[PDB]
Ligand binder design. Structure first.
Ligand SMILES: N[C@@H](CCC(=O)O)C(=O)O
Ligand SMILES: N[C@@H](CCC(=O)O)C(=O)O
Ligand code: NA
Ligand code: NA
Lengths: 253, 250
């Protein structure tokens, strides 16, 4: 039986292939996560169908009913067998689904314009002129929402007080927001690493605010958690994941 | 019921506490992994007995008979509930035991003296005057043993042909070897970082050769795997793992 694989458009992990003729099914997709999915498919010997998360979200829990959305929700309701995307491994998520060994390490950080006085999250926290934000219902926003670290708690007070105006629908909207206003975008380090390559005016501010990994998501108790985990450790050890990142992290500047 | 926790002596993760008054049981130990163990115990609400792995090994598989040793063996045989140690998460171990989410990330690198022209693994591989080696029956040795990569295959040929002379029983023995002879030691970058803080004549050569994490080990299928994973992710996210590292790490 073919596995249902939920994912989400996000350069350069997952993106539509550009071509003159219409592409169909799995052929439509390409990127780091796609190559990874291919590798896993070969190593473990399964067939699959790629489906984009219906609500177009990563995954967050509503604090009124306690229900999840996005890919996480899709996994909880067994609507998909795997989630192969830049899906962050967090404690709130690991509580409701199972992750594989991480295939990539990263960390929350800041995207801003070059040559400013701003140098750390602390600098943004103790001022209100420069607005800052994050992707809504993402792991970053949740990090700030759950944080008890003074600075980050402050920053979350700001963000929540300004939800409609500072929380964006996607990394792309956040980036453009940085490019079109006095705005600092809290986002994941790897994606910043890719983004600054196509914008000479953009840069990462400070260091990593935390340390996490991307993992393949599976429903809780799934037998694919360990299989896929092993496969990922193998790929990492023989240097294939590194090669894949080399391949997909290039895009003038 | 109390859990049995296997571990291994290794500064600064686990060491015997210095004291004038004789210490007993868990009181005997301190280090990064002991603090970690304490946090897991607080969060998950278990008690425990720390026991050093009897054979003093991390865990590798015997080529001939296929038997495992060390902490990995202790977990396989259900002689321990957890392994809390600087135990590298690897593909081959993951096939026989389970690991929590990593509490620390690292990679294999090179410990050597300062001031030489040696700048990489490749530099070591293409010569023989400077001997080099690794801990026997550990993740690094196994990495070299399994690698299809030319340079690393060549280094494995070198190490294996001189196994008796260049492989060591412990990190400390490899460090002493670096300190007392023309020898380069292949070891994990976190511990290198700890060492080059106490020996100002030593340094890491080159970057990371691979990437891996240390995880808490459990037997395959253990229900504790997930609970510990969640606790580790919690600790990471609140900044505690970082504080522990700052605490325990010229
Ligand atoms: N990769 C994130 C989404 C983007 C972000 O949170 O910055 C997640 O898994 O939720
Ligand atoms: N930390 C290693 C032992 C030391 C080494 O191999 O460098 C292990 O888990 O086996
Ligand atoms: Na889980
Ligand atoms: Na396993």
């Amino acid at each position: 039986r073919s596995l249902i694989v939920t994912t989400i458009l996000e350069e350069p992990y997952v993106l539509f292939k550009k071509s003159d003729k219409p592409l169909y099914g799995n052929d439509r997709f390409e990127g780091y996560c796609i190559d990874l999915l291919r590798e896993l498919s070969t190593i473990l010997g399964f067939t699959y169908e790629i489906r984009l998360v219906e609500d177009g979200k990563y995954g967050a829990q509503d604090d009124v009913n306690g229900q999840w959305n996005g890919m996480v929700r899709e996994l909880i309701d067994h609507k998909a067998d795997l989630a192969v995307a830049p899906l962050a491994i967090t404690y709130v998520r690991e509580k409701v689904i199972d992750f594989s060994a991480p295939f990539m390490t990263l960390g929350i950080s800041i995207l801003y314009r070059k040559g400013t006085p701003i140098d750390s999250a602390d600098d943004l926290a103790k001022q209100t002129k420069i607005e800052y934000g994050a992707v809504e219902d993402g792991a970053t926003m949740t990090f700030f929402k759950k944080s008890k670290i003074s600075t980050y708690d402050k920053m979350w007070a700001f963000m929540s007080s300004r939800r409609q105006s500072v929380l964006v629908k996607s990394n792309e909207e956040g980036i453009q927001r940085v490019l079109t206003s006095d705005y600092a975008f809290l986002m994941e380090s790897t994606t910043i690493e890719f983004v600054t390559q196509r914008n000479c005016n953009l840069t990462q501010i400070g260091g990593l605010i935390d340390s996490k990994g991307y993992g393949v998501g599976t429903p809780m108790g799934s037998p694919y958690r360990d299989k896929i985990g092993i496969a990922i450790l193998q790929l990492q050890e023989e240097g294939k994941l590194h090669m894949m990142k080399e391949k997909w992290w290039r895009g003038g500047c």
